[PDB]
Structure 1
Amino acid sequence: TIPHLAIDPFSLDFFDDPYPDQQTLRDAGPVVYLDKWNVYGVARYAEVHAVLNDPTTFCSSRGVGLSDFKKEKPWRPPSLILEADPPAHTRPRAVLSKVLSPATMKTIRDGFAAAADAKVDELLQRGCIDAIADLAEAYPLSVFPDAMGLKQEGREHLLPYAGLVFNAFGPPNELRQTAIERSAPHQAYVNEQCQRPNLAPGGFGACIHAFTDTGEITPDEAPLLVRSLLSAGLDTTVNGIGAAVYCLARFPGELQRLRSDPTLARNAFEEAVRFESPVQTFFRTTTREVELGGAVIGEGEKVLMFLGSANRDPRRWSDPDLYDITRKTSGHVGFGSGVHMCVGQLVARLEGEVMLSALARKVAAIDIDGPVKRRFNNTLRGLESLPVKLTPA
């Protein structure tokens, strides 16, 4: 009753062009079985959304990667928020929510926006640039580590550590094995910067340590919550901003619409998150026998959610393969859905919005003028290099 597919959604060929295989997954049925890794898969919007919104049945405390924490030791101490279920999840979530709250965005917006404008001005002086290294990477690196309160020394560890983290959610393939093999120096840096004395005052990190006296978290919980922001807060935005630039580069009609109304910047980034889904996948583990779209999944089974596929499901979206900066994007799962829905989505949108705003006001055309190279990662979708010529407005 449940179709079995040999598709490896973590192979390089899949990363190179996932969309045909994603339609195959959606159309095979609401619940598939991936023989390659012995996990269930859900690729339609309806089933992804249902699984995300039943944390009791599809839990996260046994890991949101392939590995089942009840069977294997996690490669690092479990995340106190990502890899926790209610009620243990509730109070750590509340703290990060306040640390990254609407009121906090107001304190950093002017600095984030100034840095966004300043980078686009700098890029326009060079003309031909790499929209990944020189923009998608350089901008988040110029605002986020500082907003965290990190010292200058050792920041080169941040992107490699993040790549390690997202590769580690994947199966024990060469991408994962090789990342873990090189991890030691990056883990040492990150763990050390999570200690209270190493986080500058007023930053995200210090604000986390400052919440240890409310009874929501204890002092020994703060370092791991800082580790969460250093895991999830940088590499995701690099791929989100790179996706937006890529879309604008591929769809000049939409760059022209954005230039004509720069207040479309925030939705243009949201549509970019739906269209490329930088975070492609996450796992859950069944805590009991469950019926999901006619399939009977037993207890203790891994369920792979195709977030990027759900965001392109024609059962949910009109013209899903078209980048539309005026699309009503509410409901996309690029940030997840439910109790675990990205707690840092206000930071991501702020970064994305003020960068697209700078582009909308300062750039007339974005033309690819070099070989595009993809960056392969078991969980993240994005580009290694995106040579573009920026024409000033």
Structure 2
Amino acid sequence: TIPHLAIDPFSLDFFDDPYPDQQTLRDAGPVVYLDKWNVYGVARYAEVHAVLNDPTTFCSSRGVGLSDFKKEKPWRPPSLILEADPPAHTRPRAVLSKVLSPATMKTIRDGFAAAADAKVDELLQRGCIDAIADLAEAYPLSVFPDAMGLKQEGREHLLPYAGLVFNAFGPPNELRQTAIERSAPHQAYVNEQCQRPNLAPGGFGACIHAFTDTGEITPDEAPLLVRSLLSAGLDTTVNGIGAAVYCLARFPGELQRLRSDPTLARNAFEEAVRFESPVQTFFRTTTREVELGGAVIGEGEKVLMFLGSANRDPRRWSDPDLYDITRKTSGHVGFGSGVHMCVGQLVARLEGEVMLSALARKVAAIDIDGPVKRRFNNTLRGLESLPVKLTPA
């Protein structure tokens, strides 16, 4: 009843151009089996959405990568939020919701916006820049590590570490094995910085530690939650912003509309998140035999959710392969959905918004003017290099 496919969604050939394979995956059926990795797969919006919102059946505590924590040792101590199910999940999540709260963004918006503006003005002086290294990477590094309350020394370990985490959700392919075989320095740096003495008061980390007082988390839980932010909070935004600049680079009409109404800044980023889906895929593990899309999946089975595919499903979206900054993007799963839906989404959207706002106000044109290079990661989709010429407004 279930189609078996030999598509490797973690192959380089797939990353280079996933969309035809994603159509094949959608059109093959509501549930596919990927013989390559002995996992179930879901590529349509409906089923991906269904799986995300059924955490009691499709659990996270056996890992949200290919590896089953019930079968193998996790490569690092499990995340107390990402790789946990309710109820253990519930209370750490609340802490992160409050640390990264509506109230908190107020405290950082002026600086994040100022940092975005200064960067765009800086890049306009050079004229020809790499929209990755000089913008997508430089800007988040200039605000987010500080917002964490991180010291200056050692931050070069941050992106490599994030690169690793997202590779480690993947299968035991060369990317993962290669990523993990060189994690010691990154782990040591990040893990050391999660300790309270190393985190500046006022920053997200110290704020996380401050919450041990409420009974919501113990002191020994705080560093891993600090660790979560240092895992998820930087490289994602890099690829989201990079995605957004690339989209604006490829859809000049939409750049022009953005220029004509900078208050479209927040949704053009949101649309970019849908359109590129910086986080491409996650797994769940079935806790029981279960019917999904008329397909019966056994207990203890891995189910691969194609978030990017769900976000390009024509069953749900009109003209999905088109970037439209006034689209109603609500319901996209680029940030997930349900109890694990991105707890850092406000930081990401703030960063993206104020940068796209700066671009909208300061830049007249963005033209690709060099070889474009894709960055390969088992979970993250984004570019290694995007040479562009910025024309000032």
TM-score range, shorter chain: over 0.9
State the distance in 1 between where 2:179 and 2:49 align: 30
Displacement of 1:359 after TM fit? Answer: 0.1
Displacement of 1:153 after TM fit? Answer: 0.2
1:202 aligns with 2:202: yes
Displacement of 1:211 after TM fit? Answer: 0.1
Match of 1:104 in 2: 104
Displacement of 1:267 after TM fit? Answer: 0.3
- Give the alignment of 1:306-345 within 5 angstroms: 306-345=306-345
State the distance in 1 between where 2:376 and 2:215 align: 41
Residue aligned with 2:221, SS: helix
Deviation readout 1:360-392 (Å, 9 max, x if unpaired): 000000000000000000000000000000000
1:387 aligns with 2:361: no
1:270 aligns with 2:262: no
- Give the alignment of 1:213-228 within 5 angstroms: 213-228=213-228
Residue aligned with 2:304, SS: strand
State the distance in 1 between where 2:247 and 2:121 align: 21
Displacement of 1:118 after TM fit? Answer: 0.2
Match of 1:153 in 2: 153
Displacement of 1:213 after TM fit? Answer: 0.9
Displacement of 1:340 after TM fit? Answer: 0.2
- Give % identity: 100
Residue aligned with 1:220, SS: coil
Match of 1:59 in 2: 59
Displacement of 1:129 after TM fit? Answer: 0.1
Deviation readout 1:130-164 (Å, 9 max, x if unpaired): 00000000000000000000000000000000000
Displacement of 1:297 after TM fit? Answer: 0.2
State the distance in 1 between where 2:382 and 2:261 align: 27
* Unaligned segments of structure 2, at least 5 residues: none
Deviation readout 1:91-138 (Å, 9 max, x if unpaired): 000000000000000000000000000000000000000000000000
| Count of aligned residue pairs for this structure pair | 393
Displacement of 1:172 after TM fit? Answer: 0.2
Displacement of 1:348 after TM fit? Answer: 0.2
Residue aligned with 1:377, SS: coil
Displacement of 1:239 after TM fit? Answer: 0.2
Residue aligned with 1:41, SS: strand
Displacement of 1:354 after TM fit? Answer: 0.1
Displacement of 1:178 after TM fit? Answer: 0.4
Residue aligned with 2:83, SS: coil
State the distance in 1 between where 2:302 and 2:241 align: 31
State the distance in 1 between where 2:309 and 2:9 align: 11
Deviation readout 1:247-293 (Å, 9 max, x if unpaired): 00000000000000000000000000000000000000000000000
The runs of 4+ residues in structure 1 deviating greater than 3 Å are: none
After TM superposition, the score normalised by the length of structure 1 is 1.00
State the distance in 2 between where 1:312 and 1:225 align: 32
Match of 2:229 in 1: 229
State the distance in 1 between where 2:74 and 2:133 align: 31
**CA RMSD in angstroms, aligned pairs only:** 0.2
Displacement of 1:39 after TM fit? Answer: 0.3
* Unaligned segments of structure 1, at least 5 residues: none
Deviation readout 1:49-74 (Å, 9 max, x if unpaired): 00000000000000000000000000
Match of 2:144 in 1: 144
Displacement of 1:300 after TM fit? Answer: 0.0
1:131 aligns with 2:131: yes
After TM superposition, the score normalised by the length of structure 2 is 1.00
Match of 1:362 in 2: 362
Residue aligned with 1:283, SS: strand
Deviation readout 1:173-208 (Å, 9 max, x if unpaired): 000000001100000000000000000000000000
Displacement of 1:20 after TM fit? Answer: 0.2
Residue aligned with 1:219, SS: coil
Deviation readout 1:329-348 (Å, 9 max, x if unpaired): 00000000000000000000
Displacement of 1:44 after TM fit? Answer: 0.1
Residue aligned with 1:104, SS: helix
State the distance in 2 between where 1:216 and 1:367 align: 49
State the distance in 2 between where 1:87 and 1:186 align: 31
Displacement of 1:231 after TM fit? Answer: 0.1
